[model samples]
Target: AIDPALPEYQKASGVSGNLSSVGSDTLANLMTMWAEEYKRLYPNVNIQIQAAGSSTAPPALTEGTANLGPMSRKMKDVELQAFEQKYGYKPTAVPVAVDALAIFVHKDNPIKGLTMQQVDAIFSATRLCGSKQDVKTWGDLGLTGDWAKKPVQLFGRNSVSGTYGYFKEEALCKGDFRPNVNEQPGSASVVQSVSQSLNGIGYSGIGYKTASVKTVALAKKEGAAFVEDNEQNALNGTYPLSRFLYVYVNKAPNKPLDPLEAQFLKLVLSKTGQQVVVKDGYIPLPAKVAEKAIKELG
Candidate 1:
């Protein structure tokens, strides 16, 4: 068992400094809570977090301006190359949680599930044709007849978002999104858009789900409709739309701060941290995965 009284425990003993982390607004709200808890554990540490999206993390990390970068997806090869060229090291990505790129619709819509291909079709500009081609109403998606007249207002993340990239890759097979969709810069904005528009349909990270919106389960294969986005399905790999959550450290931790970083990371990988993960609307990493991450931090 890890000692609760490890270095930098519960209070600061004259060690004081500021650590900055940036990137991934998708996880920003949860990270804010984590930051607050961390400060309680080591009151002397001043941690400032910024949410600029995952596209900004590589630059922030490579520039050595950030101690950690939270990302919704792993770094791409090009980004990895740039980091290696600049930092002389490959950044390690620690999987801190699991998240689903959830599709949400207004509460009034009756459509409950969608096959991956159907979702692909709905978002693909090329696949749409005529009045039915560029869908305009919930009825176009086979929703209840009464919803047919309701204009289907679409909302989505901006091109720079990791959520947008992942959704485009997995759901659209890298096809361009339909031009009619309104683009928002963050997950909360997507949620807010859907919440206010009765005919709205949008996608965002699972962290944005709330009673104001209803989430739809996405089928895995082109034709097979089997799983939904929930903790069990996400953990079991049955939720096909799930994505990994990552934290990139600047360098291998050293003494003092190293121990503190490790302790906080361990807590994040522990049942205690898992509870926070779940409570914050993300799925916890599988037990084995969390165990491995904790071991690596040690």
Candidate 2:
């Protein structure tokens, strides 16, 4: 649901220009939806979106080819440093929405829950999260019966995805993924692959969830209680994999944003913009956060 305290979007004049968004396949659909609504408000506006990966954003923004760089992860220090070298200032990063990275498995695969260590062992060859042993089979996870002897088939996004980097950092403790993990082109494909294989497990944002797959409850570490990916859990930061989605823009210091840029962002932080967040299965920002982002536009 959209935050009740969110301000209504007021139509603005002269918001016509070409807008380009390049980055984050995870945010590709959301960006398109936002662009569609923004275009509706101002028919004269033209927007182009190119989402290959989060890594593609910094270069586009640095080269001045894209006005908006949507990213699922925060800009890395190296990326920000490069941008600052080019623009003489930092790019403004706007928090747009919240997402919970979910660990998905076939609905019929009955495993109780997972600890971060177990997750690391299952997906990463390095086991940097301190797992005592590599988790290669369902029996390693305590599953009994026909599932016990089956190998754990892994699915994940390729190197270009922010989801891949985030999972490597968080669940794998900055380790490398195992070679056998099937790397998919997109987030939904990872979940779909897992659903098709009874012994398969994968990870992706909660927005891509489907009835064919079940999201596993995750514990931060061994001995911690498992946490479900719910709205409250995500918003309050109790969910282990909750993260913010962002859009990076070049807003020069002491200069107000151009009408096209400001108006588009204004609508994004508005109640209507957030409703689109809910409709797309992502969590809307709190009213306070939305208001803060709106103020930062100047």
Candidate 3:
């Protein structure tokens, strides 16, 4: 049931035209920067982008408003259904980057590490497959003495974000968010808020991490060692919150990619493109994965 709708296999050189995209604030910075560099390479093509959120991209892709959907999360079930129903084929999700979703807290908060269940209790009403109760204070998550007295101030991205959806599924047990959580407009804001308060805790991508905020290692279940976020841990399957970032397009299977579509995708999966990905604070794909992706796009 799991599959990717890779653009038709072909070369994208000597192609030029209009291109548009909408999605993923997490990927927006790198994507827009890529667009700027891409334009320098091909002055004849024009491009437009709306990095609103992953939720917004699906509608635009299905409605024919945008040919590119830069999603940080996999397409939602409802959105997948919409695209297939309308176009007679499932929308493709091309893996581009990997995001190590890190948990943020003030540097001064001495308590470290958390089980996914603890994280779930802090953010979700249903709370980690019903294994835990609502976590209102540090005490609820096993912090003791003075730390136990502190209320856990929560922060995160707006509900529409792919970051929010991924956290809900992987860390919050696919549960509803708690009413008291502070919902920010972007990932940077979530870490920024946590940086200002020792009682605060939040989650965001690696790009948003700051010296003022300390990161919490996350564990899969009780008694498990909490593993910190890193490229190695993520690639080795030890990091539970690690997720793949994606780009979506409309080129059909067995059909040659439209020259423009092929070209844009080419830049996204290129070696130079992956350099930009690392510079923007995301992990470049593994060598094997990158080769596989190039084949999928080429």
Candidate 4:
């Protein structure tokens, strides 16, 4: 039981300062909302954001240049090891939201859905299963007529993207990506590229969805049922492409986060802050998740 007026957490008095953050183009839109809303609550706190890709988080954190890092994927083992080597301990990755990795295709593409194996074939140099064919053309996936011989142009975030790594690890079964993949700089760019090219297919965060493109449902294997990328599918953990979005912070030894730092995390786990995430076209964590993240912060 808790008091409504006097909540368990509150922004400390005179907590005015700027914080620097970098990473996760996929989570940037939601983060922008948090920054705006946080400013409204504490005008004195200035938060800077740099949304390149989740892949950049390790370097930023290791270099001690960034105070916070937002990542759309869980930290890789190498990244964790590197952080320990640099800072003498691992940073705490606080889960903020669940994101469904959407697969985008040109509106003109007639294909309905694809299996995980098929996605692996299309994106990875090594296939997931034998059913994952060496996809090259629209015809390979059963497209006909004008699209039959058209090359299946690939568009995605570059190697510096957490989305790229997550797709390869989880969706493609840790397969290597092909050489010809067109690497975009941001999630929105991937969607825009797919929308513009008639033969294009791409992957991006669900937030970047537009009317110009269509999302493809995904199946795990050849005979498995397909599941659409939606809030419901993600909430139920039924969407294979769904992933956890994280915020990493250093919580080493007796040195806890400063007043401003802890406040930001508290807000992100609160109902009001999560509402901003919802408005930004992403899903907020459930109450249990919030509780766990709050406990982890403590």
lDDT of each: 0.76, 0.90, 0.82, 0.84
Q: Candidate 3 has which clashing residue pairs, if any? A: 10-298
Q: Please list the residue runs of candidate 3 whose C-alpha ends up more than 4 Å from where it truly belongs after superposition.
A: 1-13
Screening candidate 1 with a backbone cut-off below 3 angstroms (N, C-alpha, C), the clashing residue pairs are 129-133
For every candidate in turn, the CA RMSD to the true structure comes to 4.1, 1.0, 4.4, 3.1
lDDT by residue for model 3 (215-238), tens: 899888889999988888987879
Clashing pairs in 2: none
Candidate 3 similarity to native, TM-score: 0.91
Q: Which ten residues in a row have the lowest lDDT in candidate 2?
A: 272-281
Q: After superposition, how far is residue 87 of candidate 4 from its true place, in Å?
A: 3.3
TM value for model 1: 0.88
Local accuracy of candidate 1 as per-residue lDDT tens digits, 1-298? 2223322224324444676788898889767877777777678789889886888888888888887888888888998888889867677787888897799988766778877766766676854221224566677677776787778788998866888878887788777888888998899999999999988889988888888898888775546775778777776678878888988775544423355455566656766666667778887766678667655655
How accurate locally is residue 33 in candidate 1, as Cα lDDT from 0 to 100? Answer: 77
When summed lDDT is taken over every stretch of 10 residues in candidate 1, the lowest stretch is: 1-10
Model 4 Cα lDDT, one tens digit per residue, 1-298:
1112322335667567887889999989888888777788899989899999998888898888887899999888899999999778898999988889999998868889998878888888888555436889988888788888999899888888999988888877887888888999999999999999979999988889888999999997778989998778998989998988999987785676787778888888887777766776777777788887788777
Give residue 252's lDDT in candidate 1 (0 to 100).
47
Against the true structure, what is each candidate's TM-score?
A: 0.88, 0.98, 0.91, 0.92
Clashing pairs in 4: none
Q: Under the 3 Å rule for N, CA and C atoms, how many clashes does model 2 have?
A: 0
